[PDB]
Amino acid sequence: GVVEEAHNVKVIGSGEATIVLGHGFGTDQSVWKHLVPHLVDDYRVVLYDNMGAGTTNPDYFDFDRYSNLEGYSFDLIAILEDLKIESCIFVGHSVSAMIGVLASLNRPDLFSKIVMISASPRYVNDVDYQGGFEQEDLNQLFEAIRSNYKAWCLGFAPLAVGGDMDSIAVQEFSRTLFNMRPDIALSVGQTIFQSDMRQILPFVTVPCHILQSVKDLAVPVVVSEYLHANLGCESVVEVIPSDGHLPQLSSPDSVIPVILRHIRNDI
Numbered sequence: 001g002v003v004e005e006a007h008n009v010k011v012i013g014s015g016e017a018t019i020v021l022g023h024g025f026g027t028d029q030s031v032w033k034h035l036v037p038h039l040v041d042d043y044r045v046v047l048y049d050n051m052g053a054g055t056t057n058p059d060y061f062d063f064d065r066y067s068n069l070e071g072y073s074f075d076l077i078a079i080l081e082d083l084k085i086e087s088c089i090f091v092g093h094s095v096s097a098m099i100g101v102l103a104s105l106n107r108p109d110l111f112s113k114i115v116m117i118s119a120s121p122r123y124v125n126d127v128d129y130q131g132g133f134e135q136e137d138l139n140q141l142f143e144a145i146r147s148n149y150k151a152w153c154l155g156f157a158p159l160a161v162g163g164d165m166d167s168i169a170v171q172e173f174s175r176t177l178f179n180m181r182p183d184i185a186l187s188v189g190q191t192i193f194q195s196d197m198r199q200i201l202p203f204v205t206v207p208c209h210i211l212q213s214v215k216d217l218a219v220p221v222v223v224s225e226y227l228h229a230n231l232g233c234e235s236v237v238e239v240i241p242s243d244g245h246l247p248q249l250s251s252p253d254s255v256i257p258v259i260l261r262h263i264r265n266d267i
């Protein structure tokens with residue numbers, strides 16, 4: 001199909017239970033490479049790339065459709081329907097956690113569980129809300145993107161990934177980040193980093209598992225507490241002893257067992 005091709009959809013493993021994995025900004029489904037081997041024996045696993053990822057066709061990036069996160073949520077619902085999936089566990093990394101939340105507001109019937117990795121409803125600080133960024137920080141980021149995309153990618157990747165600045169995961173993410181079209185990276189970067197999902201959290205009904213690294217430059221720990229406090233569904237938080245915004249890529253020994261526990265066990 002065109003949309004499974006457009007999103008590089010892969011379906012692997014086998015189970016009576018389906019799990020769908022959604023990746024974050026700057027990466028692609030390869031971010032799940034250390035998790036998938038532990039899923040394929042028990043679950044049917046669906047991987048897909050968000051439109052605008054470096055692995056996707058820039059001809060298909062519709063700036064109108066993706067000026068809002070719900071454009072990505074509609075892509076996810078369209079993938080689920082075309083695969084004839086009527087129920088899945090959704091695992092959402094970074095922005096995909098909020099995309100998964102919006103999709104569950106539109107179609108709560110399709111999700112039995114949302115497992116969030118490195119999620120945030122809002123990155124900019126607000127009154128009695130610490131998201132971790134002032135508007136001037138984001139403006140500096142967008143200007144660096146415009147000014148020299150390759151230089152921005154090389155400085156950003158170690159900060160996003162954390163840990164040793166020369167690790168395999170920093171190199172992987174530096175590569176996928178630079179492979180994004182820079183005009184798409186700026187537009188998506190602005191859309192994501194300036195988003196605000198706080199208002200719809202009390203209306204979620206799908207149970208949510210809120211996981212993050214204790215040390216994450218884009219997600220202060222108090223964000224996980226905010227999510228837990230304001231999500232209207234039942235939820236649970238686990239702050240992992242790990243560093244970085246893509247911990248399932250860079251620190252699998254400490255992170256993958258935590259993700260598996262929350263996939264395999266319900267609230």
Ligand SMILES: Cc1cccc2c1N(C(=O)n1ccnn1)CC2
Nearest residue numbers: 025094095159160192217218245
């Ligand atoms: C890790 C990181 C390091 C330094 C500045 C920033 C990041 N952010 C991200 O990645 N995203 C946030 C949502 N989607 N991606 C937020 C801006």
